[PDB]
Amino acid sequence: SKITVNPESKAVLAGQFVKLCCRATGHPFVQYQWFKMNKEIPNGNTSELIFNAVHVKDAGFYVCRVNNNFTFEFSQWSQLDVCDIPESFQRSVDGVSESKLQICVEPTSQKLMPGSTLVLQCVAVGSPIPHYQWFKNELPLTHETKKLYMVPYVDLEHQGTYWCHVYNDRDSQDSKKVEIIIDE
C-alpha cells in the first residue's frame, strides 16, 4: 500500500550506527524489502535498514519496496554517503549517526609555489545529505560541488581566500575561510 515515511539521503562517518527508514500506512501489516540499487539486500525484510557500524563499502543508493496483498510501492531513493576520516576529526560526533549538519574536516591555509598541487577539503555529515559549493574571494567557484577542491598545477592566479558553503534545506554552515599564498 501507500508509504508514510520515505528514507532520507544522508552522509555519515564509517564505524557509526546508521538506519534508513520506510514506513507504510498498513504497518506492521505489510511486507518490506530493501534494495541497494537492483540488488535485493538479504534479511532487509523490515521497516528500517540498520548498519550497526557502517563501512565505506555500504555507501550507495537504496530503495524500499512495500507490498500489501494486492499492491506494490517503491519508496524514494535514499543516498547513503560514508566518509572515512581520522578519529582526531570525530570530536562532537559519537558512534551513533545524528541528522545535524556539521563540518568534520575543515580546509587549511597554505603557502605553495607555482606548479604545486593545491588540495582543499571540507567534509560534513548530516541528514538530508549535505551539499558543497566552494568559494574564492566572495564568488562561487563554478562547478566546484564536492568535498574536494583540487588544482593540479597552481599558477599565481590561484592565490586568495577560500571557503566551502555546506548546506541542505534545514541548515547551512560555511567552513573556515583559509588563505592560499602562491609565491617562492
Q: How many residues bind a copy of itself (CB under 8 A)?
A: 24
Q: What is the C-alpha to C-alpha distance for residues 158 and 119, in angstroms, rounded to an integer?
A: 12
By CB atoms closer than 10 A (0-12, 13-18, 19+), residue 145 is: middle
Q: What is the C-alpha to C-alpha distance for residues 68 and 119, in angstroms, rounded to an integer?
A: 51
Residue 19: CB minimum distance to Cl ion, A? 6
Q: What is the C-alpha to C-alpha distance for residues 184 and 181, in angstroms, rounded to an integer?
A: 10
In the complex with a copy of itself, the residue whose CB is nearer, 76 or 108, is 76
Residue from 4, 25, 29, 40 that binds a copy of itself (CB under 8 A)? 40
Stretch of residues binding a copy of itself (CB under 8 A), selected from 16-24, 46-54, 70-78, 117-125: 70-78
Residue 172: CB minimum distance to a copy of itself, A? 9
By CB atoms closer than 10 A (0-12, 13-18, 19+), residue 68 is: middle
Strand, helix or coil for residue 139: strand
12 has which bridge partners? 82
Q: What is the C-alpha to C-alpha distance for residues 59 and 77, in angstroms, rounded to an integer?
A: 13
Q: Mask: binding to a copy of itself, 3-22, rule CB under 8 A, as x and -?
A: ------x-------------
146 binds, among a copy of itself, Cl ion, none (CB under 5 to 8 A by kind): a copy of itself
Residue 20: CB minimum distance to Cl ion, A? 5
Residue from 34, 132, 135, 163 that binds a copy of itself (CB under 8 A)? 132
| 79 is a contact residue toward a copy of itself (CB under 8 A) | yes
| 38 is a contact residue toward a copy of itself (CB under 8 A) | yes
Query: Helix and strand tally (H, E) in the chain?
Result: 0, 20
Q: Which residues bind Cl ion (CB under 5 A)?
A: 7-8, 20-21
Question: Which residue, among 7, 15, 9, has the nearest Cα to 104 in the 3D structure?
Answer: 15
User: Footprint of a copy of itself on this chain (CB under 8 A)?
Assistant: 9, 35, 38-40, 42, 61, 65, 72-74, 76-79, 128, 131-132, 143, 145-146, 167-169
